[PDB]
From a paper:
Type I RM enzymes house these activities in a multisubunit complex having ATP-dependent translocation activity that pulls thousands of duplex DNA base pairs through the stationary enzyme, eventually cleaving at random sites distant from the recognition site. Upon identification of an unmethylated specific DNA sequence, two HsdR motor subunits, which bear the endonuclease and ATP-dependent DNA translocation activities in the fully assembled DNA-HsdS-HsdM2-HsdR2 complex, start to translocate the duplex DNA toward the stationary enzyme from both directions, producing two extruded DNA loops flanking the enzyme complex. The X-ray crystal structure of the HsdR subunit with bound ATP from the Type I restriction enzyme of [name] plasmid R124 revealed four structural and functional domains forming a planar array: one nuclease domain of PD-(E/D)xK type that houses three endonuclease active-site residues and a QxxxY motif common to the RecB-like nucleases; two RecA-like helicase domains of SF2 type that use ATP to translocate duplex DNA without unwinding; and a C-terminal α-helix-rich domain presumed to contact the HsdS-HsdM2 methylase. ATP bound between the two helicase domains was found unexpectedly to also contact Lys220 of the endonuclease domain, suggesting a means by which nuclease and translocation activities might communicate.
The three mutant HsdR subunits were crystallized with bound ATP, and their X-ray crystal structures were refined at 2.74 Å, 2.84 Å, and 2.99 Å for the Lys220Arg, Lys220Ala, and Lys220Glu mutants, respectively, guided by the higher-resolution structure of the WT HsdR-ATP complex (2.6 Å; 22). The crystallization conditions used previously for WT HsdR yielded crystals only for the Lys220Arg mutant; the Lys220Ala and Lys220Glu mutants required altered conditions. In the Lys220Arg mutant the ε-NH nitrogen atom lies 3.7 Å from adenine N3, bringing its proton almost to hydrogen-bonding distance with the base edge. The closer of the two equivalent ω-NH2 nitrogens lies 3.1 Å from ribose 3'-OH and 2.6 Å from ribose 2'-OH, enabling one or more potential hydrogen bonds with the ribose. Thus, Arg substitutes structurally for the Lys220 interaction with the ATP base edge, and can make a novel interaction with the ribose as well. Residue 220 is located at the base of a loop made by residues 215–219 that is well-resolved only in the WT and Lys220Arg mutant structures. In the WT and Lys220Arg structures, where residue 220 contacts ATP, Asn221 points away from ATP. In the WT HsdR structure the backbone and sidechains of residues 182–190 are unresolved; in the Lys220Glu mutant residues 181–191 are unresolved; and in the Lys220Arg mutant residues 181–188 are unresolved. The crystal structures reported here show that mutant Lys220Arg HsdR maintains contact to ATP similarly as does Lys220 of WT HsdR, whereas mutants Lys220Ala and Lys220Glu lose contact with ATP.
Numbering used by the authors: 13 to 140, 149 to 180, 189 to 583, 592 to 859, 873 to 886
The structure:
């Protein structure tokens, strides 16, 4: 009985007017009542408290007196000092209070029955703003915000903890205009707080369920809702609440059903017992897989659950997270001691480990009791090389097992390259969520891939398709040639802030990575960066330097780098040591070259790249696979990437953040265009690249038509033209209609400008807006910096952009109309783009 349905029957309108908010609320209440949600009238905190007393007393089979209830309220349920985070902690972890009565007996008082869900009492109330609140055992856990049919859901979200304090217990938010319904977690954290994280409910085929009637009839089925709240909502060690998306739940629950059905049939340790999940890169594989293992421990018939990852994919939050379930057993090292120690932990089913360690252990160990136990394996995006050996030993040793795997880049026959196919190893595909689905849902970002062809001397070298010549090409004469490195480094320095959206004043923006071909490349780059930055530091006292850092150790798959720095040669070792010394100096930290020091350097670095304490990370093969950095928008690539490695590296930029991050920038100094198309194609079909790859500069300036949606889009020059024709201003106002039309138009302007900030052509056009009128030192400087010859420099002067001041006036008027709107249904303001500018 899956809560993400294989088949659902699109319901019928009554009807029975569906236009207004109270109409939506009427049908919502009626439908929920048909679904077994008792409706009650609660006008106060007092009445809520009373109702809760009733439900909890019934649920726990106990009766408080007024003194005991008051004490229970003040010290556990209703603590005045409690915030939202404390209530979430109470729902997810601390949901049992061991209470001392007046007669001095001790009893466990549950807020929720998680063992038997349906014993829980669900109820509904309405607003005491049109809202409908779902109470579980009296506690409000769900909030449905209702808006009129006309109201744009993104603006509705844009609009909408203290008192009444019981509403701190809120876990799940849902907001509907009746055409569309979107759910999102309740939290105080602000980094997941944008519209991009709101979610549509769906089926196993990931077909969306937009409207309120069907959302209600599916997501709001008591069994579905309660399972989403209790079993499908992850609370991490940073006290962040993440509600899972339908594809994550579908995959997870299908894995659970698979394990159980395979156990009932006593059919195990063969491909048909387990399964694989194809979840496109960035879709949340680590979150879901770890969650699945944790749920798999809840099966009584299972003795042990292995959750296994690749040390290559480790980073700060993830290690912090694994530490509590498997103390000091998860790291870069080869040591199996922590693994075999956790393996002996009494009354404990979960073991997190790295594939390296599991393989080492399975190599060294023979008679381990676990081999004979009923075991579940969950593999999270493991590289092929280690995985094969691990599989050989796994097959030979564990006698009763169900193994599962998550990947965003499966192994088909056509990419086999010496290894076994994913299907051969894991058997059936239990669920799929592909790249095109993810991009359709906006849960993942597109790529803008561009070869920067600025360098004629090195061009034929950068276009080389032959594998052997490329290997031979790494030296000071060809790829590592001082001028090439200097030109690239100068480009990256010059265009960094532009790429990363640091350009407009006071803007926070993003950061970037530089992926390179080898250790010598990394060294050359770091050195050149320091040199050029010191020179620019001389040239100007107003220069504001970037913070560069690097990490690497020793070696279309991306080559793994061990955490043992001893394997490095002396030159690299000394350069890394020097780099860590400098890093230590600036950041006031102590990390050393030794195993532990380098391990903690890796950790601290991951952390500082995630929060933008470091502006550009110069890496070779590290952090190119699993690294999670939503604020990283740009990857610079001097390296040969193909297929799964290509997709995995590029995906470092694919994390959604908000309206500011439109897509990830991939700026390459070697021609990757063909490899990009091949890679995207392998993992999709011949049309996949059109959905994945962003369109051209010319298309965004002059207009085009999107294939997937079918909609026509302006047309930034068209937008600007309409701004000047229709709104010379202030007289182009004052009526309401003109205000509205202007808000819509300028909205388009802001979205288009924001998009075009990532194109060198537009950056150049904008750049040209200071320049000349007498001394052409800055003219030739403009030509050299933007690599623009005279033939272009002539035409760029012909293209009229609107004056900076006119833009400022537009922006301030836009903001004014917004503030006024606070004190119009179709209209959506760009809050996110505004708040930066
Ligand atoms: N259901 C969700 N709700 C909120 N945030 C989510 C959800 N699922 C994933 N995320 C966020 O998306 C980001 C990427 O998650 P994650 O690294 O698990 O994806 P992945 O597919 O494992 O990535 P990769 O393919 O690089 O290994 C994380 O920061 C995570 O917090
Ligand atoms: Mg991951």
């Amino acid at each position: 009985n899956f809560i993400v349905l294989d088949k659902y029957i699109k319901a019928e309108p009554t009807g029975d007017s569906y236009q207004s908010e109270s109409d939506l609320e009427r049908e919502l209440i009626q439908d929920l009542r048909n679904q077994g949600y008792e409706f009650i009238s609660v006008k106060s905190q007092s009445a809520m408290l009373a109702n809760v007393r009733e439900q909890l007393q019934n649920l726990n089979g106990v009766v408080f007196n007024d003194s005991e209830w008051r004490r229970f309220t003040e010290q556990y349920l209703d603590n005045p000092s409690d915030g939202i985070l404390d209530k979430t902690r109470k729902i997810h972890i601390d949901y049992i209070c061991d209470f001392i009565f007046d007669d001095e007996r001790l009893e466990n008082i549950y807020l929720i029955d998680k063992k038997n869900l349906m014993r829980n009492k669900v109820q509904i109330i309405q607003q005491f703003r049109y809202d409908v609140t779902i109470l579980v055992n009296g506690l409000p856990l769900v909030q449905i915000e209702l808006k009129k049919r006309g109201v744009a859901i993104r603006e509705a979200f844009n609009q909408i903890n203290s008192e009444n304090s019981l509403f701190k217990y809120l876990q799940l938010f849902v907001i509907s205009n009746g055409t569309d319904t979107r759910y999102f977690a309740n939290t105080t954290k602000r980094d997941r707080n944008s519209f991009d994280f709101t979610m549509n409910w769906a089926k196993s085929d990931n077909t969306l369920i937009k409207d309120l009637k069907d959302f209600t009839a599916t997501c709001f089925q008591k069994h579905t809702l309660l399972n989403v709240l209790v079993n499908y909502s992850v609370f991490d060690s940073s006290q962040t609440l993440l509600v899972m998306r339908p594809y994550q739940i579908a995959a997870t629950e299908r894995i659970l059903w698979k394990i159980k059905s395979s156990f009932t049939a006593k059919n195990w340790s063969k491909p048909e017992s387990g399964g694989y999940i194809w979840h496109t890169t960035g879709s949340g594989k680590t979150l879901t897989s770890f969650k699945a293992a944790r749920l798999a421990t809840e099966l009584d018939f299972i003795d042990k659950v292995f959750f296994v990852v690749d040390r290559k994919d480790l980073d700060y939050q993830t290690m912090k997270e694994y530490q509590r379930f498997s103390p000091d057993s998860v790291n870069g090292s080869e040591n199996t001691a922590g693994l075999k120690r956790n393996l002996d932990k009494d009354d404990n089913k979960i073991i997190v480990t790295t594939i390296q360690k599991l393989n080492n252990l399975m190599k060294a160990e023979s008679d381990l009791p676990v081999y004979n136990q009923q075991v579940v394996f969950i593999f999270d995006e493991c590289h092929r090389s280690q995985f094969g050996e691990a599989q050989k030993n796994l097959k030979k040793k564990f006698k009763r097992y169900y193994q599962f795997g998550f990947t965003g880049t499966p192994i088909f026959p056509e990419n086999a390259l010496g290894s076994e196919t994913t299907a051969s190893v894991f058997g059936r595909e239990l669920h799929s969520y592909v790249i095109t689905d993810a991009i359709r849902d906006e849960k993942v970002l597109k790529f803008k891939v561009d070869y920067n062809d600025v360098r004629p001397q090195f061009k034929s070298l950068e276009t080389e398709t032959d594998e052997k010549k490329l290997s031979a090409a790494e030296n000071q004469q060809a790829f590592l040639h001082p001028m090439r490195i200097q030109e690239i480094t100068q480009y990256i320095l010059n265009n960094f802030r532009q790429k990363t959206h640091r350009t407009f004043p006071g803007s926070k923006g993003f950061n970037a990575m530089l992926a390179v071909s080898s250790v010598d490349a990394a060294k050359a780059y770091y050195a050149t960066f320091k040199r050029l930055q010191e020179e620019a530091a001389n040239k100007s006292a107003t220069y504001k330097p970037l913070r560069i850092a690097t990490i690497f150790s020793f070696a279309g798959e991306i080559s793994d780098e061990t955490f043992d720095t001893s394997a490095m040669d002396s030159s690299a070792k000394e350069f890394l040591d020097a780099a860590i010394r400098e890093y230590n100096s600036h950041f006031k930290t102590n990390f050393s070259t030794d195993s532990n020091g380098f391990q903690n350097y890796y950790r601290d670095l991951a952390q500082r790249v995630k929060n933008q304490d470091i502006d550009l990370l110069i890496v070779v093969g590290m952090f190119l696979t699993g690294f999670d950095a939503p604020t990283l928008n740009t990857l610079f690539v001097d390296k040969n990437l193909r297929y799964h490695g290509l997709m995995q590296a590029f995906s470092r930029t694919n994390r959604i953040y908000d309206a500011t991050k439109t897509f990830g920038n991939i700026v390459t100094f070697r021609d990757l265009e063909r490899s990009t198309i091949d890679a995207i194609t392998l993992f999709g079909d011949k049309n996949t690249k059109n959905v994945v790859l962003e369109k051209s500069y010319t298309e965004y300036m002059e207009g085009f038509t999107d294939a997937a949606t079918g909609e026509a889009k302006r047309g930034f020059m068209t937008v600007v033209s309409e701004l000047e024709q229709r709104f010379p201003d202030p007289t182009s106002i004052e009526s309401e209609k003109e205000k509205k039309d202007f808000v819509k138009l300028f909205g388009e302007y802001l979205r288009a400008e924001n998009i075009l900030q990532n194109y060198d052509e537009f950056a150049t056009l904008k750049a040209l807006q200071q320049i000349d009128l007498s001394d052409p030192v800055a003219v030739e400087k403009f030509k050299a910096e933007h690599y623009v010859d005279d033939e272009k420099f002539a035409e760029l002067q012909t293209i009229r952009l609107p004056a900076d001041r006119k833009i400022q006036d537009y922006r301030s008027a836009y903001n004014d109309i917004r503030d006024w709107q606070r004190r119009w249904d179709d209209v959506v303001f760009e809050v996110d783009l505004l708040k930066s500018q």
